[PDB]
Amino acid sequence: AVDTAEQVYISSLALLKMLKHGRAGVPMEVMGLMLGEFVDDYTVRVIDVFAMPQSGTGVSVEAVDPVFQAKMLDMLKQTGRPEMVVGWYHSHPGFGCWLSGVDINTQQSFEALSERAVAVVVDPIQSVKGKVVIDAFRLINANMMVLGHEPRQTTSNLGHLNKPSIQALIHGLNRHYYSITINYRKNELEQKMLLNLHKKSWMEGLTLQDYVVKEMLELAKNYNKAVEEEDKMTPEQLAIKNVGKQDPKRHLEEHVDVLMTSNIVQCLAAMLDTVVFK
């Protein structure tokens, strides 16, 4: 009846086992399970993610052991929070992380167990640092083809997620499926130390530790002189003369600005004499 676009709140702790357990299955595809709480129709949260045994014979719906979860939920009771299960996830490192033929067969089984059972995919390969990558989807019922086939209200959270549209075969699965919006509920307490732990460990280890003399400048002078004539022949090549040769051509970069910063490296590193000492 009434269906509203869902918003997925992921915890920074749940983001860990998505890429981490997925990295352990690389190259092969894994099968996980999502753990969280259903607040309402238009929003959903995943508060935890745990690792499930990887299948070396290929992913199947029987790869999830029911006594593995029954022993896990009991261990979650003695753990701080015993929250009910919600849905499943699987890695797909070998390709662009789209729902395979097994993923649709385990859909109607998991959506019978739990109401939503959001399908979540993840890939390591698409980037390293500055991209969300991952993936998510939710099955829209094929029996609804008799009814209105274009959910959801509050559109562009889908529509904008429908950008880039990610080639063809991916959105070729937009038949019988619709993706879901992933935003981050603020962990910033942990996220503030995530930046502090990362950059401090990357700043000279104490900031002190790190803080071929003339010879490095004799090797640099070959880049600061012998590179000049191959750079300064181009203005004489800009002289035609004049003018039979196709123009414009700009040879100014990148050596000029590199030798600039090359002195910026050597000047402030030589200031270590004046800085460290006295």
Partner: protein
């Protein structure tokens, strides 16, 4: 044995997210769990772990319990998904260690020959690269005490892994990287004097406190020994650089020369080419 450890931000978060678990229900003590190490070599690495319900009474300061039904079967869980991952020890968020911590390691030595404990910090404050690591050995003592079991500090360092920087390094997004060669090295210099000379004053005041009170530590002897290794140059009045004086500017010899030589021709590249392309568009248009 264990020399240095590698703590990932992922496994350290597994201590931090459990601080939300039992932090809302309270009450006393801290977050404690069992550590799953990855040992490929003498250098120790940690990937994942599992947090276990744990409590330490005050009164009763020596009372501690792990849940070992949680430790046994959940090991067969992580072992089934990851064959390489095994328990190398335990951890906790400290911030400091009560004397009772001697008994936590000796109990679990049945699991691992040497269990390394990792003291972590949920709220970053000071003074630097956070958390901590200890190793369990027996040095006895020189004074003749019965055999003394005291955890020795293990240097901790953060490390990375493939595919784990996807979501981790994404959420910050506010950092400027880096920039190497201009600001990166100089900000360290301003801090190298700060963080270098603050521990200089903190220790020299505690070393003066020795004569006053708190003796032992005598230490002995490690304090003055490496301090005298720092004494290869003091450097005191005035700098004792008579041999390093002409050599001082002689290291700045070519650095200033090239900086004079590069800026001359870089100008010839910048000044000439700018004037050329400028007047070609400027005056030929009008």
């Amino acid at each position: 044995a264990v020399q240095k450890v590698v703590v990932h931000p992922l496994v350290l978060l597994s201590v931090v997210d459990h601080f939300n678990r039992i932090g809302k229900v309270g009450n006393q003590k801290r977050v404690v769990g069992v550590l799953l190490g990855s040992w490929q070599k003498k250098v120790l690495d940690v990937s994942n772990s599992f947090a276990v319900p744990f409590d330490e009474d005050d009164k009763d300061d020596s009372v501690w319990f792990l849940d070992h039904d949680y430790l046994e079967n959940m090991y067969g869980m992580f072992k089934k998904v990851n064959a390489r991952e095994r328990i190398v020890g335990w951890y906790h968020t400290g911030p400091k260690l009560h004397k009772n911590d001697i008994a936590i390691n000796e109990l679990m030595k049945r699991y691992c020959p040497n269990s390394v404990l990792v003291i972590i910090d949920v709220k970053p404050k000071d003074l630097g690269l956070p958390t901590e690591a200890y190793i369990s050995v027996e040095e006895v003592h020189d004074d003749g005490t019965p055999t003394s079991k005291t955890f020795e500090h293990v240097t901790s360092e953060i490390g990375a892994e493939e595919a784990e920087e996807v979501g981790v390094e994404h959420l910050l997004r506010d950092i400027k990287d880096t920039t190497v060669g201009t600001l990166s090295q100089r900000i360290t210099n301003q801090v190298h004097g700060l963080k270098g000379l603050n521990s200089k004053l903190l220790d020299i005041r505690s070393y003066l406190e020795k004569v006053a009170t708190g003796k032992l530590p005598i230490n002995h002897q490690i304090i003055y020994q490496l301090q005298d290794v720092f004494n290869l140059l003091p450097d005191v009045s005035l700098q004792e650089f008579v041999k390093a004086f002409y050599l001082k500017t002689n290291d700045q010899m070519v650095v200033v020369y090239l900086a004079s030589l590069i800026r001359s021709v870089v100008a010839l590249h910048n000044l000439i080419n700018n004037k050329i392309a400028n007047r070609d568009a400027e005056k030929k248009e009008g």
